[PDB]
Amino acid sequence: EDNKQFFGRHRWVIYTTEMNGRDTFWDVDGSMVPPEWHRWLHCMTDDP
């Protein structure tokens, strides 16, 4: 996070390069976020 950016750019995730079985170096998608970090990332809550 960085709270000096405007709302929307103040939280982000650098995805892993190796998910369950597939190589996610280039192929990433928002579905790879687990539900708890999904709640934090979409600003449904302030607490990680």
Under the criterion CB under 8 A, does residue 39 sit at the interface with other proteins? yes
**Rounded CA gap, 30 and 34, in Å?**
10
Under the criterion CB under 8 A, does residue 35 sit at the interface with other proteins? yes
DSSP annotation of 37 reads H
**The tokens of 32 are what?**
């790879």
Q: How far is the CB of 20 from other proteins (least distance, A)?
A: 13
Cβ proximity to other proteins: between 21 and 34 the closer is 34
Under the criterion CB under 8 A, does residue 48 sit at the interface with other proteins? no
Among 16, 17, 25, 43, indicate the residue that binds other proteins (CB under 8 A): 43
Q: How many CA atoms lie within 13 A of 6 on its CB side?
A: 0
